[PDB]
Design an enzyme around this catalytic site. Structure first.
Site, mmCIF file in Angstrom:
data_model
loop_
_atom_site.group_PDB
_atom_site.id
_atom_site.type_symbol
_atom_site.label_atom_id
_atom_site.label_comp_id
_atom_site.label_asym_id
_atom_site.label_seq_id
_atom_site.Cartn_x
_atom_site.Cartn_y
_atom_site.Cartn_z
ATOM 1 N N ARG B 28 45.523 16.494 55.397
ATOM 2 C CA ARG B 28 45.873 17.713 54.667
ATOM 3 C C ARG B 28 44.661 18.607 54.414
ATOM 4 N NH1 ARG B 28 50.039 15.669 49.956
ATOM 5 N NH2 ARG B 28 51.586 14.708 51.360
ATOM 6 N N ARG B 32 47.310 23.274 50.494
ATOM 7 C CA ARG B 32 47.372 24.148 49.325
ATOM 8 C C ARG B 32 46.147 24.143 48.399
ATOM 9 N NH1 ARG B 32 51.688 26.847 49.390
ATOM 10 N NH2 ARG B 32 51.364 27.696 47.281
ATOM 11 N N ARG B 41 50.120 31.181 54.235
ATOM 12 C CA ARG B 41 51.436 30.573 54.168
ATOM 13 C C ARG B 41 52.453 31.525 53.525
ATOM 14 N NH1 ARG B 41 53.500 25.551 55.185
ATOM 15 N NH2 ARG B 41 54.285 26.219 57.245
ATOM 16 N N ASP B 77 54.444 21.141 59.948
ATOM 17 C CA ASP B 77 55.323 20.770 58.860
ATOM 18 C C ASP B 77 56.141 19.543 59.227
ATOM 19 O OD1 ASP B 77 55.728 22.951 60.695
ATOM 20 O OD2 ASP B 77 56.470 24.239 59.079
ATOM 21 N N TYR B 155 63.682 10.608 55.678
ATOM 22 C CA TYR B 155 63.875 12.014 55.337
ATOM 23 C C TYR B 155 65.265 12.473 55.705
ATOM 24 C CZ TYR B 155 59.005 12.840 54.101
ATOM 25 O OH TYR B 155 57.775 12.800 53.478
#
Lengths: 357, 357
Positions: B28, B32, B41, B77, B155
């Protein structure tokens, strides 16, 4: 002045003695998976159907009416200690356990009560325990419990559940002093609470370190282990000084595979295991002194009763008949079939006897 | 026909070769925690600022502008594969990754696309990879990735995140056949996808088995391990048949301490570790053949830059200078300080050289 214990298989295994069969019980045996549990719980809010001794006693006795479990554990709600310390809880049906105003700054520690007055605030728990011990009439032993200091700290700082415990862990890295202060307050509150549970009739004690897995070896040894050790030491000492017989103590650190070796030397008779640790490896890690409380994947109960018997048989073969208490790797889930919980219990009893005969 | 690689320290360590220093990168790194990441983004929704090659290339390059990382990983993603298979995602700012209509019944598998057509649906990822490889100009290697079959299945069945994976695990126990069918569909889609990433310019591949920890040894070996093995085998075979040079492959099973031994024999050059596994014990479990990608507690970055250097130094001493690639135990958190990420990177480089000189 309580009824004499009839079936003490659970206590003997806990002390490491040989037994005719393997004792079994389930974390959350008094849980939402039972219809009767939801009905009784629906009397009032969470902290009301809990604050009523007869209500808690009933919830505790419910699973025993369905299954021949070898122990009962007092029904109680997580956040009782933090609550007794002065924090306000807002238990909702959707979220569940929650503190609308979590501890975030060091100054927040000032609103907490002196840990020495917590026991008097938890008198309702003691009453429920005595009542349950009386009503059990010595059928099986009664287990008292509490959450470990670190895990209680995570609830107080996070305000509820979290997948990372990032806020709580940030406290460990950024506010190590304040963290130790909070962990000490929690320890000084747990000791008298646990001692009070034994005085009220608890014949064993389990400390749940449910959020152990979020910490790695280093942080665990720094902030969780010392207090896990202090609790057992202090509880045993106070019980002796009071003229009472210490009870067997269980330490359960969910996702704490990395700490199995330290935990086997932390002063607890039993070390609970989650389902991710292979029985044999756990045996290696803990040694040959302590008793292992044993880990079936709670989700395994979704399988058929037949598949459950086989998984239980394999689990028993790995653990071996010595120093072992069967149980799940974590608490039961709300959507599980009571009939499958019965199959688990019956399978442990059947196979453990075969593994001996 | 891409630029020649200048710094290949990451690749050499991955193959098990000795290096002048320990290479480092962060899961990552394009995340963010970086202000520039949120701005880029914020151009459009999730699956739009992702479907744009220039946008994904920019996100990938951003951390490298701040830190001298030894590798870049393509920004992408999670749910792209399930999406390419025919499932609809509704990425919201609050919840995040979500499938409004999860798979729950076996019949639900019929709405999925033939895994053979998935690669053509993910062409935008391939374009972003080629573009990033071109723009990197051979500075450091480019890592491609995907999530492992079991994790992708969680998921698709859960519809998003879960603390227990109870719905997905119920599939394993109640619908073992349907589970194997789904896991196979996922494997047949991942192989061509991963092969396509290498064809587009990826110089290494990492498979994320993020939800490994929910399974115990038995279920993992039954439903996760076989497919983890199949992916590496098939990807290597197809690359060879195409005349291409296989790339080093990394298997990361978060909370998969119980599977370290199996994973070191699963056909991957590198085995990533979470922060709960002590380096030395991990070394024992994996052996002396494979390379270990290494686990600093991401939350450790909340500590001061000085404390970070010391924790990094200790981490390096445990791992040893051989067969090791530094990294965190999990992806970076959104509220982490970029300056602290720089300290981690600089500390690994400084100490790894001292540990050698």
């Amino acid at each position: 002045g309580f009824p004499e214990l009839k079936n003490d298989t659970f206590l003997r295994a806990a002390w490491g003695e040989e037994t005719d069969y393997t004792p079994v019980w389930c974390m959350r045996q008094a849980g939402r998976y039972l219809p009767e549990f939801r009905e009784t719980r629906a009397a009032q809010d969470f902290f009301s159907t809990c604050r009523s001794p007869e209500a808690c006693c009933e919830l505790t006795l419910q699973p025993l009416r369905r299954f021949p479990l070898d122990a009962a554990i007092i029904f109680s709600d997580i956040l009782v200690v933090p609550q007794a310390l002065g924090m306000e809880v807002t238990m909702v049906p959707g979220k569940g356990p929650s503190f609308p105003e979590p501890l975030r700054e060091e100054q927040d520690l000032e609103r907490l009560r002196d840990p020495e007055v917590v026991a008097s605030e938890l008198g309702y728990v003691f009453q429920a325990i005595t009542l349950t011990r009386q009503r059990l009439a010595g059928r099986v032993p009664l287990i008292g419990f509490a959450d470990a200091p670190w895990t209680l700290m995570t609830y107080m700082v996070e305000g509820g559940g979290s997948s990372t415990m990032a806020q709580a862990k940030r406290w460990l890295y950024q506010r190590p002093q304040a963290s130790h202060q909070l962990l000490r307050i929690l320890t000084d509150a747990l000791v008298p609470y646990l001692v009070g549970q034994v005085v009220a009739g608890a014949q064993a004690l389990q400390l749940f370190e449910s959020h152990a897995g979020h910490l790695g070896p280093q942080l665990f040894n720094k902030f969780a282990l010392p207090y896990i050790r202090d609790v057992a030491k202090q509880v045993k000492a106070r019980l002796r000084e009071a003229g009472l017989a210490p009870v067997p103590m269980i330490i359960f650190a969910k996702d704490g595979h990395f700490a199995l070796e330290e935990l086997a030397q932390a002063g607890y008779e039993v070390v609970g295991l989650d389902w991710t640790v292979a029985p044999k490896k756990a045996r290696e890690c803990v040694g040959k002194t302590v008793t292992l409380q044993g880990n079936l994947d709670p989700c395994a109960l979704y399988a058929s009763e037949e598949e459950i018997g086989q998984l239980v048989k394999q689990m028993l073969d790995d653990f071996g008949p010595h120093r072992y208490i069967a149980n799940l790797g974590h608490g039961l889930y709300p959507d599980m079939d009571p009939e499958h919980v019965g199959a688990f219990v019956d399978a442990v009893h059947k196979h453990s006897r075969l593994l001996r005969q």
